[PDB]
């Protein structure tokens, strides 16, 4: 699994409030979180399906 998949979601320093997805490795599912609009970490997807294709495991 890529190493970023187990990291907590990162809102970042931006003031926006955009709904993104992170892979929740303990649930084995994607979950939504509020993203501030700049300086994303890599556990940050536009869709559940992208989070699972990247992070869901072989």
From Swiss-Prot:
One of its GO terms (biological process) is negative regulation of platelet aggregation. The keyword Transmembrane does not apply. Keywords: Disulfide bond, Pharmaceutical, Protease inhibitor, Secreted, Serine protease inhibitor, Signal. Its main location: secreted. The record marks 15-16 as: Reactive bond for trypsin. The keyword Disulfide bond applies. This is Pancreatic trypsin inhibitor. It comes from Bos taurus. The chain holds residues 36 to 93 of 100 of the full protein.
């Amino acid at each position: 699994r890529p190493d970023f998949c187990l990291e907590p979601p990162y809102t970042g320093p931006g003031k926006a409030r955009i709904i993104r997805y992170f892979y929740n490795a303990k649930a084995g599912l994607a979950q939504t979180f509020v993203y501030g609009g700049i300086r994303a970490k890599r556990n940050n997807f536009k869709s559940a399906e992208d989070a699972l294709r990247t992070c869901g495991g072989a």
